């Protein structure tokens, strides 16, 4: 009897803000009278991809840190090393740098 | 005032009577509109020869701008370039023809100079002589802020008039008579 | 003798307005605090004093065939004064806002430096060919206007026509206009702003006004034109942007036969595809902006 | 039919209308205060003349994916606001996800210029997608480790443990580094000044505004602005005291924290140039991920240190 009430409340405001998006466009419409980009954008775009994915985990960490002792703080701190060691590795090719 | 319009340079144009002379919630409306029109207006500086720095000193991407000020001399080879940049731009526009180069020849009757843009789009307001300062500038953005202040235009493609209505404004040589001939002395220019 | 230091104050002036619009216009590209800003006093203030010597701002259409269109009024020493001694700040502010975006130092440095070569076989008669080494100036050369009496040293770069020499070129040129102006003001002739001579067009006013023959003179060269000897003449002089000349051939008439206006953005501009052979955009975007050409001055 | 539930239920359907209507307006408002800090009624007139023009399809594109690139743009970090609250009792989400929802509301926000990028039937308006499509990427990947400080710091994922979290003492002090990651992070998605317009160098890229106009490009306006001013408020609501004040009330306070916040972004609008390309991605691949990691790490170390 309250969390009934605020899921009405998320209901109605994403359906009236989206309401009134459409009702705003079409007051706005009623009214009036062989190439390729690159791959380094790939490369940053797959970079953002496994470090987000990476930072899933470390997501998962963030909420369950206390009910989990120092060995789960050794675990993530092992794979926190994982991706710091791979963000170095690409920080040292030469793979991150832009130079345009 | 009478009014002009214009319904669908060789266009028609014959003098009419306001339709708000004859629902006053469709004047109240028509006002506002105007009014929305007169106090929001997005000017679209076009590149050109050399009344730039008085466009640059005085204070933009196109298709969002209703005003066009067509600033520089008007050549055989820029002139596709102005009638693209004006067709553009979307209705409601209005034009603001700056420096003698605009509202005429402006200098040049030679054979690569179009002898102003009235030639090819309408203009809406003129400022003359070589370069304007930015006052006269910002006194014709009042002039046309007027002049968009009383017009009468449709509100929708679907009931009304499809016709917009432009102002036979009284012109400013007229109106400003009395204070310019009533001028009796100037300083001398042997000073500063 | 007077009508010559008021050319050479008027056009050290606007020599000035366009070296200072030149140097705005590269510095604003990178530090961008306050590159308009700086610069706008200057040149409204020039703006300004051109107003009161002459009519409008940009075009004074104050120089008359054989002196100036008027006489310089009694406030010009008063305006002059309070412009020479504001500015050496600012040529110190504007030395050190060239000198602090090291950034742009190691950048425009590298790319598309022409050195002594293209730039005595394109034309080039701007900053870049006093860049490239080649001390060459018409007001030291070939004198025009009396620019003798003025004691003024021509800054020249070294080896290459860097985009950083010519602007450099373009500040120790604003100095070196500045002292023009300063002895401009030092010692200033007292005699006539027209030179005596029939052919000055337009005679003085207060003659034509009350004078039977200088009406004459005034009334035939206004209407029909100044009738002169057929002959061919050539002025070159150093513009605000490069070399400026006018040939003149007269066929004994009241207009001219034939004027030919040579241009130094012309050959600034033709010598663009023998430095971006193998540059990139936004190379082209950079030298297009380091490049003084004006496109009305090319097409005339 | 009157019963007291039902009048209740009401009244938090009218307090969700009024937080959208004010959070619409204080953008729309704010949009003409940061133009005067470079007169109310001129955004109403704009908004008239905005309404009273045409939109313009172009003949090109499709009416779909050009007309939607708006609609993310504005009605994601809109929804995005949704998670804020303003007080205890004057709150409209109370889910349990308070930090996850915003983390995709800001991974669905490169939609919109992407989606633009490609309606602008032209090839430097892409490229400029591109790059800006790069860049919130880019620093989008750490925002969510900018905000898992805060999170493990606090212990859940909701605002309300957040904000009950910060009652001894708030977490802009022992994690100045995870606010500045966020308020980089937070600058670059919003495509705020210093990390904007990247087309800056190159000539062969151009904007994903261009060719928008009328209604389609008023809803970038004012989405981007909608989208600052929620992001303040996620930033006061994590590292500031959320509605936490002495003797003003709390909505009061956080109303003034959020404004004390833009007026900071108009500080930032006025202060700092804008870095170059390769600055800008080298700086948030180099320094932000690993310093935003050791953050993560150090508050571990120290959240599980002092727990007795
Ligand atoms: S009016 Fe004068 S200043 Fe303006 S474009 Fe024409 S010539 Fe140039």
Request: charged residues 15%; neutral net charge.
């Amino acid at each position: 009897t309250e969390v009934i009430a605020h899921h009405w409340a998320f209901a109605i405001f994403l359906i009236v803000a989206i309401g009134l998006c459409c009702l705003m466009l079409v007051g706005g419409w009623f009214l009036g009278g062989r190439l390729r980009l690159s791959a380094k954008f790939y490369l940053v775009a797959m970079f953002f991809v496994i470090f987000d994915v990476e930072a899933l985990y470390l997501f998962a960490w963030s909420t369950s840190i206390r009910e989990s002792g120092w060995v789960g703080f050794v675990e993530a701190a092992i794979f926190i090393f994982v991706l710091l060691a791979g963000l170095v590795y690409l920080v040292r090719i030469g793979a991150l740098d832009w130079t345009p | 005032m009478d009014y002009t319009l214009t319904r669908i340079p060789l266009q028609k144009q014959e003098i009419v009577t306001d339709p708000l002379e004859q629902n006053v919630f469709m004047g109240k409306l028509n006002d506002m509109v105007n009014w929305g029109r007169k106090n929001s207006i997005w000017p679209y500086n076009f590149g050109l020869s050399c009344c730039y720095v008085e466009m640059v000193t005085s204070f933009a991407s196109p298709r969002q701008a209703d005003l066009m000020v067509v600033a520089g001399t008007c050549f055989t080879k820029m002139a596709p370039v102005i009638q693209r940049l004006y067709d553009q731009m979307l209705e409601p526009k209005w034009v603001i023809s700056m420096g003698a180069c605009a509202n005429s020849g402006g200098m040049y009757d030679i054979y690569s100079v179009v002898q102003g843009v009235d030639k090819f789009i309408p203009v809406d307001v003129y400022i003359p002589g070589c370069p304007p300062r930015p006052e006269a500038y910002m006194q014709a953005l009042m002039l046309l802020q007027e002049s968009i202040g009383k017009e009468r235009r449709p509100l929708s493609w679907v009931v009304g008039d499809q016709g917009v209505y432009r102002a036979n404004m009284q012109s400013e040589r007229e109106r400003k008579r009395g204070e310019r001939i009533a001028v009796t002395n100037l300083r001398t220019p042997d000073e500063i | 003798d007077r009508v010559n230091v008021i050319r050479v104050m008027l056009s050290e002036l606007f020599r000035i307005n366009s070296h200072l619009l030149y140097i705005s216009t590269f510095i604003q590209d990178v530090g961008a605090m306050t590159p308009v800003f700086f610069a706008f006093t200057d040149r409204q203030k020039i703006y300004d004093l051109v107003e009161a010597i002459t009519g409008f701002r940009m075009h004074p259409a104050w120089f008359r065939i054989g002196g100036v269109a008027h006489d310089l009024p009694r406030g010009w020493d008063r305006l002059l004064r309070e412009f020479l001694d504001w500015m050496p700040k600012r040529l110190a502010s504007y030395e050190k806002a060239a000198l602090q975006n090291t950034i742009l130092k190691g950048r425009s440095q590298g790319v598309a430096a022409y050195g002594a070569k293209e730039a005595l076989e394109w034309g080039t008669t701007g900053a870049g060919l006093r860049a490239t080494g080649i001390d060459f100036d018409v007001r030291k050369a070939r004198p025009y206007s009396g620019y003798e009496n003025f004691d003024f040293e021509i800054p020249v770069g070294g080896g290459v026509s860097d985009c950083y020499t010519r602007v450099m070129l373009k500040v120790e040129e604003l100095r070196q206009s500045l002292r023009i102006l300063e002895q401009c003001l030092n010692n200033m002739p007292e005699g006539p702003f027209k030179a005596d001579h029939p052919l000055t067009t337009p005679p003085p006013k207060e003659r034509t006004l009350q004078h039977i023959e200088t009406l004459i003179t005034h009334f035939l060269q206004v209407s029909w034109g100044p009738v002169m000897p057929a002959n061919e003449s050539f002025q070159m002089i150093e513009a605000t942007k490069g070399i400026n000349s006018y040939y003149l051939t007269s066929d004994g008439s009241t207009m001219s036969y034939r004027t030919r206006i040579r241009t130094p953005s012309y050959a600034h501009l033709q010598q663009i595809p023998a430095a971006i052979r193998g540059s990139l955009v936004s190379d082209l975007i950079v030298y297009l902006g380091s490049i003084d050409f004006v496109m009305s001055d090319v097409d005339r | 039919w009157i019963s007291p539930e039902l009048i209740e239920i009401l009244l938090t359907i009218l307090k969700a209308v009024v937080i959208l209507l004010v959070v619409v307006t204080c953008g729309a408002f704010m949009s003409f205060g940061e133009r005067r800090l470079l007169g109310s009624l001129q955004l109403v007139a704009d908004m008239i003349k905005m309404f009273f023009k045409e939109d313009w399809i172009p003949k090109f594109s499709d009416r779909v994916i050009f007309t939607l690139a708006p609609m993310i743009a504005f009605t994601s970090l809109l929804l995005a606001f949704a998670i804020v609250p303003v007080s205890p009792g004057w709150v409209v989400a109370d889910l349990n996800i308070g930090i996850l929802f915003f983390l995709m509301m800001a991974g669905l926000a490169v939609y919109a210029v992407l989606f633009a990028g490609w309606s602008s039937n032209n090839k430097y308006s892409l490229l400029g997608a591109m790059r800006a499509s790069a860049q919130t990427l880019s620093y989008e990947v750490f925002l969510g480790l900018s905000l898992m400080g805060v999170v493990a710091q606090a212990g859940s994922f909701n605002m309300t443990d957040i904000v009950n979290s910060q009652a001894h003492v708030w977490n802009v002090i022992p994690q100045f580094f995870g606010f500045i990651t966020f308020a980089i992070a937070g600058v670059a998605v919003c495509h705020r000044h210093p990390f904007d317009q990247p087309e800056a160098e190159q000539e062969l890229a151009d904007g994903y505004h261009i060719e928008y106009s009328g209604m389609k490009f008023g809803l970038f306006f004012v989405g981007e602005y909608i989208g600052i001013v929620t992001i303040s408020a996620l930033m006061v609501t994590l590292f500031f005291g959320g509605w936490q004040g002495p003797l003003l009330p709390p909505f009061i306070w956080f109303a003034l924290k959020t404004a004390f916040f833009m007026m900071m972004f108009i500080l930032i609008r006025a202060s700092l140039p804008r870095p170059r390309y390769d600055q800008v991605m080298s700086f948030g691949w180099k320094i932000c991920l690993p310093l935003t990691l050791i953050n993560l790490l150090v508050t571990a170390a120290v959240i599980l240190w002092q727990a007795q």
